[PDB]
């Protein structure tokens, strides 16, 4: 009963560059030979895909279609859909998916907070803030770089895209990294990067670290 | 502990030490020629000793004995060639230190260790060869006098 | 007879995100009806080449062989041979291209000289690259996130670093005048290379990034 | 059947002080009494080569030929030819070498950089570059010296010399020697020496150490 085609999300292209369309289709009764397949607009062939999943335990079938395309084919504006068949459908569905393209292009623009001072007075944990906002279109992707060396994302979390009240179509977004007051103490340039295709490059990264807003304290000056 | 290990097993417990006395009386009656071992960051040139020529002065001084940041060790002073260790990269000298050792297994620590075991012979072989050490030198003749039978310094 | 087929450089691919391949045949005497098809590693033919070049003032044919193929196959590996049909040649001649070891490169940046700032003429930045592997890196220039014309930075080419065999190394300067060096004018370096974990690194430095930061120490006479 | 006729380098007679000119013959058929005669433009033979080696690998015997003369016929720009007679070629074959007169000169200018103050933190490595620029023409010459020893041949690596962005006529070239970081601290002077044609003395000498960019005027010291 229940029929998608995921269009691809620019945070798996960007991980990936192996840009997938998915076709998901379930809520309905465990049968066998059901026929899943993918064309684009004007129905071309695509690969045959496979590892299809098996029925769900709540006795629900399940049926995955992959299609695996490059950028320029996601790009270039093809309405793909995702085709089934099987004996109890009157006529096999088919499902359309594109891009919609036609949306506002603004560069985003980022800033690192440091920890609060009363925060680094107790001095068990700090937490690092990483702001993201001014940004049309949504769905951008952010992560942060260690020392040159990356982090899994269970210890910092990301937050989603609302919409900006102000601004008219601008979006914004934070993410929240937590570590131990100690290392904060040390250096550790804690690097934050973000990801969207608005930028020159599509990368752009920020750097704060324990001695980067204290402010001089002596103007001494020598005259003879 | 000197008295312990020559007697007295769990406070004069028995005597049977007697018995291990005939044991002291009983033991009486009668693969790698490959150049494959690459190459490890953490290490330049040992220089405990002085720097390398044209390098001139870089001693290191033994540590004293009786002191609380160190020295909790009550053996003797630290030899400044033990300073000099080269650890390998089983430790880093990061901004503040330290270990980048924590998700390993036993195979791969093993290989660090050997790896560490090369770097360290090939540095000390080095170092001994052109006669800088202090026990390596010579008087000022060859550097090379004192020569064991075996083509090393 | 020249047939020779470029391999798309990195470069190239991360500037455009369209990966091509191009055969050409040239360096030999003016003809007519000369075919080139690129094909995959079975023999899967592709899209052939438009736009071919005539019989060029120099008393060359150069029928130019161009593919678009984008990069999940090339990242395969897979062997992507462009044969060529000639009226001398009795058999068409085919080759072979393929993509064929991974660190991490560095980059540090060289501020001007304090000699080059005393006559007062000119200075030079420095972008650094070192420590990677394979070689083919890209680099350029950004101002205040603006972009500079490519002929005001030169970039070098990759050299075998002494000590590490595998490890390479690359130089890139830019030249700027003095005086807005000194109010600022950040200009940062980028660099991408397959080796990184998002392609893409940035740096910068100006005026004032070795001072204390700490305390403000002047003299007066 | 190819000649080779290599005009001697800037270094090489620079650190010989004297000049050799070579011309060689391989690709020939293999046989040895190949008579090499070393003449100059207005035909003036002078001694022939010695020690001709064996045949190379692919079944060709290669055959050497220099001589050597004095440097002042060579700034002449004399076209020196060498003639070679042997039993496979019918008439001798005959290649003139010259200087490539009619080259602008301009003095060119030597910095020295320091390693960067970011990589001193790894206490691993460092590197020091002597840049030079500002030249014509070409084949330059670097060295490195250490408070008055020479060093090996393979601690450093200097560039190749290649146009400039702006003065078309004027070139630059870089060389980066790498050094362990401990001794840095003391300093060494680790000096740069240059040698080009166009200098009035040929040799140029620049040097640096740790404490080179300091105030040498107030000694202002912190600590908690």
């Known amino acids: ?28 009764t465990t049968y066998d ?19 299809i999943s098996e029925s769900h335990p709540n006795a629900t079938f399940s049926a995955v279609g992959e ?47 440091p920890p609060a001072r009363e925060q680094l007075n107790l001095r068990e944990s700090a937490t690092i ?9 949504a769905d951008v992707f952010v992560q942060w770089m260690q020392r040159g060396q990356p982090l899994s994302p269970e210890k910092y979390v990301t937050s989603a895209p609302m919409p900006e009240p102000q601004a008219p179509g601008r979006y914004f977004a934070h993410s ?29 990264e920020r750097t704060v670290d324990k001695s980067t807003g204290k402010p001089t304290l002596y103007n001494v000056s020598l005259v003879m | 502990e000197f008295l312990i290990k020559k007697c007295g097993n769990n406070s004069a417990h028995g005597e049977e030490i007697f018995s291990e006395k005939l044991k002291n009386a009983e033991k009486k009656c009668k693969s790698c020629d490959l150049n494959a071992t690459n190459y490890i960051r953490g290490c330049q040139s040992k220089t405990y000793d002085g720097k390398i020529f044209p390098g001139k002065g870089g001693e290191k001084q033994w540590i ?17 060639r033990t300073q000099n260790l080269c650890v390998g990269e089983l430790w880093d000298k990061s901004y503040g230190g330290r270990s980048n050792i924590k998700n390993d297994t ?26 800088t050490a202090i026990i390596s030198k010579n008087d000022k003749k060859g550097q090379k006098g004192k020569n064991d039978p075996n083509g090393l310094p």
Chains 1, 4 share one sequence.
């Not at chain 1, 691809?8 to 809520?27: G, H, R, W």
């Not at chain 2, 004293?64 to 400044?80: E, R, V, Y």
């Open chain 1, 67 to 113: 299609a695996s395309i490059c950028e320029d084919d996601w790009n270039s504006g093809e309405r793909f859909t995702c085709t089934v068949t099987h004996t109890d459908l009157p006529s096999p569905l088919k499902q359309t998916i594109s891009r919609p393209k036609g949306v506002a292009l603004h560069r985003p623009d980022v800033y690192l907070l």
């Open chain 1, 129 to 137: 803030t990483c702001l993201v906002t001014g940004f049309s279109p």
């Open chain 1, 33 to 51: 030979s059901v026929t899943i397949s993918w064309t684009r607009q004007n129905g071309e062939a695509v690969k045959t895909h496979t590892n």
């Open chain 1, 1 to 28: 009963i229940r029929v998608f085609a995921i269009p691809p999300s620019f945070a798996s292209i960007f991980l990936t560059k192996s840009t997938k369309l998915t076709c998901l289709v379930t809520d309905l």
């Open chain 2, 64 to 80: 004293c004995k009786d002191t609380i940041i160190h020295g909790d060790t009550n053996g003797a002073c630290i030899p400044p």
């Open chain 1, 176 to 204: 929240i990294l937590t570590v131990s007051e100690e290392e904060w103490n040390t250096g550790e340039t804690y690097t934050c990067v973000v990801a969207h295709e608005a930028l020159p490059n599509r990368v752009t």
């Open chain 2, 106 to 131: 036993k195979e791969l620590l093993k290989e660090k260790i050997k790896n560490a075991i090369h770097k360290e012979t090939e540095l000390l072989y080095e170092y001994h060869d052109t006669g």
